[PDB]
Symmetry: D3
Subunit: 230 residues, 6 copies
């Protein structure tokens, strides 16, 4: 149906969970979904559709970086009529009070990318997670009573950032963690009147040197439950 | 104590409500606060401190524009040790589904100002309302059962915008309304590890032509109650 | 007549003196104008109209920052058919040869704001004081034989500037002082084929630590006389 | 050894061919390499190392977008001591004289990304293919007598570009085709004193509507032979 | 002494008149100066030094564009200890009320160049003519009773401007004329605590189609006399 | 025929060699061309047309800086129907492995100018030398067996660069040398479907302190021979 998706309208649930690693999406589909069916594997993206507690739910990879997720997200909302996209994955901690294995729920994401300025007449577009999704994720976390930090994330275009002072600058402003897609996902959802959100498990701290499964499983519980609530 | 505030540390409550119009802040202090005392009137800013349901609460004007509120907000957090600043006021509707008299709670604010790029190494800083404040405002609205729209706002540097296409662009991305301070307030709160939020009553629609007291009073109820919850 | 002005066309003189502090404008009106009449007090802006040496002259506040003065100035030229706006006020010295209490007449103003780039297709617009006004102010100063420095000013969006190196950079280029409106005022006057200028009394030096009435009164004499000459 | 590569120094040849699609890299390894061994499959990237005409050669996916390839390329040069990276893949034609199935060899690549400005103090960095690689690709094409167009490419951050006028602008300047990695690859090679180049087969035209295997196989012949020449 | 000047300190007068055309500078030296001596001809720049009414005065070409004049001006202030540089030449009219053959005295100059942003931490630097020079030029014009328009000029990097809407934009803001050096000259003078100014004779109108000697001679009279006054 | 060229269509050969110094172009015409005829001397630009090995060839100055060469190059392609422009001249070495007297052939040129962003919707345009010209220059060098380095150049707007860190940054990325026109020349050739290239002899090193005729003559041999090959 699209240059990056062989599936047809209806093959995807209205709620899709996405992570960068296609093998993680495969794992997620085999571990948490019932009767997972491979609906798209163009570029080995591992797009599946199954059910969770009886409700349709899809999981698919989105690659690394804003340009990548921008391709997948826009096609999902536009062609497959998806309504909600929840980004699930790992991230690097920025804030000194954020530790490895911590779970973070993004209220929004800053970025050093030019994509949003291109879409917003060179002005400041606040890549903001859909309030419904942020609420669904936080309520799920509260109901499951799983500690989670809510706040700003940063989507960098440079995993290996030349601007070494940026890290401390973000710490001063209390950005929670760094990843590479949220800032791109959020504005696309707005344009399509759809919804998006993001939750990550800190797998490393960029300001200093500091089991990882429990944290990842807890994050998945939150995303899945929130998905049902939505 | 500061170039724009004659008050001394302790004269202001840890929670301050702010609006652009100094006469509105005076009105608010005389109408909703008990035993309001003028604590600062440099530049006729009308800074008062009284109590609401027994709790200390201050109200003060902040002028129009990011540069103005940036002066007042930074001094309040830094010198007067204020913890929470809730911006209350009017705004212009952008989204076609947003109507005059509607109450809007900002999740974040975009801007055409250069201030955040100056503070954030020329990158995209998501001027995000503190999640605690957004929640306090929304819960108050739910408890008072007062319809309110939650979403993105836009803080313009140009009330009379030369870029006439921006209005429709923001409508496509579903920005709710336009004002002139939020985008400046939010990042300052982050820097001081403090909190900030914003709630406005739509007093006009910028995309077409379309009582105003009830809406303003309801907005004040929400802000005041949320202030107590915080 | 406008969202920020209750006065009607004709209530304002063709020449208006403006300062940030509304209480200063009130003081100016009661101290230097004959039969001052309050013509506008929306947002407590203190807009008056009286006479000086028999000629009509208005004085009104304009708040702090380019966005604020941009609102007031554009409405004055456009709706109230004002012809000349002379900004009078205080400023911070930059140049090491400029001292506190010195009077400065702006030839132009630089800025770290994005407003002029928005109006000028992202290019460099030289916020220049109207040559007639600069001349009127300088001749008045010469005739009153009051020492005054003529040169570049800087209109910052950030009173509390994070970029601490900017101060010395401006000293190297010999910017005289810093304020927060001139750079916004000047281009608006050009657009309306009207005139604008600015004169300030240095109330503090930003590069080091260093009666204030005489300087302020002398500055007012210059502005008033120049107003008559125009 | 790295967050995205499980292989160890020595597992990769000094010359690596890369394409966005991991399944294409798998296909390439099974079709053109002798004794291909999977050396890295983190995130299903399909990194292989085999031999072509007796010489060591690796093939691996790099995902879509500058941020993605920037991660893989920098790790290859820095950690695995790779010397040459030749990007092989598909692209969209821009120039009206460029047709679908045409083979294009990039001399350089323009971009709407902010990555190079971040690495180059906000100036214009010419993402240029290594002259040795451009020559090796062109000589191979000449020796194999396979028609190929040499010229500028464009690496977009937005596959679905909102700026619809850009396409015709690039046509006027004669950009040959569009892809999403070259502009990111080239500067990284320069920084590591290494080499990089790109060759693509046009799979579609963005300015109008206009077998695909022959073109892809011919492109692979050129890349492989050039790899040997280097 | 410098890469572009063979003269030695002292060969140039403290006041130098400059124009783009080296042949015009030669003409000026032979027509208005007494005992003109060629002091520099590197790159055929035609740098002369003679006397006018007994006072030392130099005339030299400066090429076309900000980068060119920036080279010559900085060397003159820095190495040859020049104090005043008055740019004399031709320009294109912008304002509809400005006609061919009109003489224009620049108060300042806007630009689409990046040079000033590079020198001014990416902010808006107002390329302003030295007030002493502007005054000297205007007084000379008044004393010689030669009609001259005083106002903003624009220094473009593109004589053949692709942005065809800029012309009308500048007309709306009342820029008087266009040339290619002033915006570069002015900031350099500031840095060296020296002085600079510009006066031009409109040789063509860019907004419509509309003897040239008288205008040029009158402009030279103004510059020369002003030079003496300084 | 044009504001900067008195010659008429046909007076210039389809291949023009250009250098900044007009006296160097005169020297080149008298030293390497047979029967050189002055075809244009507006602004003393020294435009000649003669023959080399029986083929028509023109040589003309282009001044210093992108704005200057942009004027001359665009008029040559557009009005005089020139097909190839080869920039010949001197440059400053950047790379530590590049030494004075070395000959450099530009593959492309980076720049700190805003011209290309203005022509390319504020994106990154890779100022790339025409591949035919780069090849002609390199083959000539190989056939004449004259050592020459091929790589990136940088066209600065500031000969006296305030950003002193840029030099080392470019060294890290291996820019070969610095000049002031290439980045402007290349994009203009693309727009006119014509060709351009550049070759320079390093006359100085900007990173340290380190006969000059042989190098200049060898560079001229390469340019001339390449001109014939084209
Ligand atoms: N520390 C980290 N820094 C950045 F920039 N991204 C991180 C980090 N940890 C995980 N990620 C996620 O995995 C990919 C990058 O390895 C990207 O897809 C990103 O979302
Ligand atoms: N329609 C509107 N557009 C903009 F830009 N700001 C609005 C609007 N309505 C109210 N405001 C609030 O009042 C002031 C501007 O009049 C500013 O202080 C701002 O916060
Ligand atoms: N030192 C100073 N720095 C800056 F940025 N602005 C100054 C200063 N002194 C006075 N002002 C004027 O008063 C207000 C800021 O307090 C603004 O309205 C401004 O015009
Ligand atoms: N027409 C096209 N436009 C763009 F922008 N990229 C193209 C096109 N065809 C193929 N590609 C390559 O495949 C991916 C995008 O589908 C990216 O990885 C890119 O390199
Ligand atoms: N109409 C005009 N437009 C521009 F952009 N520059 C003009 C014009 N007329 C004369 N000049 C002066 O001469 C040179 C450009 O031909 C430049 O050196 C410039 O100063
Ligand atoms: N070291 C150098 N740095 C820069 F920026 N340009 C150089 C250098 N050497 C020679 N040039 C060439 O000569 C003129 C500048 O003197 C310009 O025309 C330029 O092309």
């Amino acid at each position: 149906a699209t240059p990056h998706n062989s599936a047809q309208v209806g093959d995807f649930a209205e709620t899709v969970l996405m992570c960068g690693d296609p093998l993680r999406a495969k794992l997620i589909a085999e571990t948490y979904l019932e009767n997972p069916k491979l609906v798209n594997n163009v570029r080995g993206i591992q797009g599946y559709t199954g059910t969770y507690k009886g409700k349709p739910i899809s999981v698919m990879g989105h690659g690394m970086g804003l340009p990548s997720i921008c391709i997948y997200a826009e096609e999902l909302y536009s062609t497959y009529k998806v309504k909600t996209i929840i980004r699930v994955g790992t991230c690097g901690a920025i804030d000194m009070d954020i530790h490895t294995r911590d779970i973070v729920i993004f209220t929004s994401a800053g970025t050093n990318s030019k994509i949003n300025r291109i879409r917003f007449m060179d002005h400041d577009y606040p890549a903001t997670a859909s309030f419904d999704v942020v609420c669904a994720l936080v309520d799920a976390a509260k109901e499951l009573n799983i500690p989670a930090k809510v706040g700003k994330g940063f989507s960098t275009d440079l995993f290996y950032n030349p601007q070494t002072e940026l890290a401390q600058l973000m710490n001063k402003f209390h950005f929670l963690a760094v990843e590479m897609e949220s800032a791109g996902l959020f504005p696309i959802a707005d344009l399509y009147g759809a919804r998006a959100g993001c939750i990550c498990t800190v797998s490393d701290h960029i300001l200093h040197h500091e089991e990882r499964q429990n944290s990842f499983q807890n994050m998945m519980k939150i995303a899945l439950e929130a998905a049902i609530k939505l």
